[PDB]
Design a protein around this ligand. Sequence first.
Ligand code: R8A
Length: 330
Amino acid sequence: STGSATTTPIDSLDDAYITPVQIGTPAQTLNLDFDTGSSDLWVFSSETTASEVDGQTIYTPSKSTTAKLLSGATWSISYGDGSSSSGDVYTDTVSVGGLTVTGQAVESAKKVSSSFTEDSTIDGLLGLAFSTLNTVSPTQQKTFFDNAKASLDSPVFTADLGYHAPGTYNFGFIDTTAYTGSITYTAVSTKQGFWEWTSTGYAVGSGTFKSTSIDGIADTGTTLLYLPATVVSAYWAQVSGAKSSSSVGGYVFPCSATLPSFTFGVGSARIVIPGDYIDFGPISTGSSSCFGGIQSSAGIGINIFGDVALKAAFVVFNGATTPTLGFASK
Ligand SMILES: Nc1ncccc1CO
């Protein structure tokens, strides 16, 4: 089997992407934020505290003839940005782009933090990291991809995120028309439960490539690209007027600037992030200070190849017995 679904930016900055997902019988379609950085599929629901729902579409398990309460199971997740949600668990049929999984754990939110309430466009998250990170207790549950894997034509999914445009998540096949050149594969460590790999270096604009190992994760749930302070300082030093602002929370730059590209290495291959992709717009409405899309990881503990980086590539998440990541230009 295969599946293919369009993913759409939630706003004009590509802050996140939503993909329609069919849950239950008859189908309830919710727009979920496919997340390479977590292993829980959770949804706003008829159980979510009413004051914490503000425009999201909810899953109502009592209206699904295939929903079953997973007795005793609870979940609670705290994400790297300080957001959180928790609740109980149903199993139900979940379909993405024509690919159907029966008995998928659907984690129903009883509580969500303010940033989840304030995003009316995101009805939940569909985790695509390794199932070892799933938070369901006392019996950890499998991700949608893990459940679908055996049925797929090939045990892979691909992320083709658009710049200010829709893109595609495919399951079970590699669309050879969706990228240019060849796909370069690189080793993955699953020891932390993430799609963790090592970039071979970077360049700023037309500058020379610096060969240096940069360990990080391929996280489509992070908006930005978080890299070591040395790398980030070298990037922003090429933008007149750019500075790190403690009050704003990162590097900012004059909105009148033209940003240089940023290149990252994948083995001997190179992925070029155009400068435009690094512009996240005014820090507040009407400001001439703009927020940068490349930021320091120094306070995180891990480097993060988020949407800024991934949207410049066609990315293969290869879930073979020894997982690997593939990157192609497009
Ligand atoms: N990947 C993620 N998923 C959900 C919330 C936050 C992040 C990243 O900070």
